[PDB]
Amino acid sequence: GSATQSPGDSRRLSIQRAIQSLVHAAQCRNANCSLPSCQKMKRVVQHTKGCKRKTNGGCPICKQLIALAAYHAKHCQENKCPVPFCLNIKQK
């Protein structure tokens, strides 16, 4: 009757949803979405594709995105993966 799950489990679902939005927006360049998550995520994903500033250090926004993708890249060896970070972490 709690439905709170174990602390590690509950934080795992929520963190995976963040990754699933990064995966969504990496594949998603369509205008057919009107939800807030997709709008901010496509904003930052198309940004990270045109952002040399992230490896140049002066961009904390992409530091968040690479943190999801790093943890995710430890488990995911996918060479066809939508997320550009995920490859650039586990390949290099």
Binding site: R11, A18, Q39
Partner: protein
């Protein structure tokens, strides 16, 4: 009260980026990435 409402996106550059960063910071937990000297 409650008149003013936050705008959808901005061409300012950096203020809009930290606003993006905010949405994501609340979207995921992640590790605290600190030792954290708090109860």
């Amino acid at each position: 009260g409650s008149m003013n409402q936050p705008q959808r996106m901005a061409p300012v550059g950096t203020d809009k980026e930290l606003s993006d960063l905010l949405d994501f910071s609340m979207m995921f937990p992640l590790p605290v990435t600190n030792g954290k000297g708090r109860p």
